[PDB]
Ligand binder design. Structure first.
Ligand SMILES: [Cl-]
Lengths: 120, 120
DNA sequence: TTGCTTGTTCGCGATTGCGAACATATA
DNA sequence: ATATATGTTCGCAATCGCGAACAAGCA
């Protein structure tokens, strides 16, 4: 199963998690931005650990969506926080980083586009 | 109803549809990129027609997602096409533009991250 | 043994977000 | 009558994606 991530699959999961190339290269791949661009362009294969961390971030996203679903089924119309600046996010989440900020942006954007939540 | 879209809501739906600021400003707002950045930063209100066009694009996304859901319920593991370059997408879709390209990118990324489709 | 692999670094053109200024049309 | 909202253009620092070159680590 692991190790079959294509370059375009990596680009797609990165874009869906709403990560910039530099952010993922610095915090996930722990490599230069050029190496991440090479991975997404097909020059070098996607490392196994990078792929596994992608799936892990996907699972974290699933947890967030599940909490919001719990709130929805209870009759709530959620007012979800969509942090424009990363510093505003880290002021409310000291043990997080830009990865969690982008994940929160993605979940809030999805639940607004679906029409179930308003963003503040 | 129309006119309640905030700046952050516009930014969120734009990023969800995987649109760049320049693309949305050129093809959707039909304004300069500076005016779109002003809209998304809260300098001026989001026009009603731009809002409604956002919602219409969301509906088109729902159409695509429903087609792929039908394919999934039939037992198929979809091999979704993720176009890295816009010219490839337009060569496969003559009557489309960058909006449909970004919509298809977002949908394919969603169905790959969910774990139901492979990208080619 | 060294070709394929993979990473870093540098340079450069293209692109972006934003401040600032200008213009308009309209209440 | 006129502030005010809203669009445009211009310049600029910052950022990004890419080509090309260099280097280490192999198998
Ligand atoms: Cl409701």
């Amino acid at each position: 199963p692991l190790g079959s991530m294509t370059n375009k699959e990596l680009q797609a999961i990165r874009k869906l998690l709403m990560l910039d190339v530099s952010e993922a290269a610095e915090h996930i791949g722990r490599v230069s931005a050029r190496s991440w661009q090479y991975w997404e362009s097909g020059r070098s294969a996607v490392p196994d650990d990078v792929e596994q961390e992608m799936l892990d971030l996907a699972s974290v996203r699933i947890e967030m969506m599940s909490a919001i679903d719990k709130r929805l089924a209870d009759g709530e119309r959620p007012k979800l926080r969509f942090y424009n600046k990363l510093d505003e996010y880290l002021a409310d989440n000291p043990d997080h980083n830009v990865i969690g900020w982008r994940l929160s942006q993605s979940v809030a954007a999805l639940y607004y586009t679906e029409g179930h939540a308003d963003l503040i």
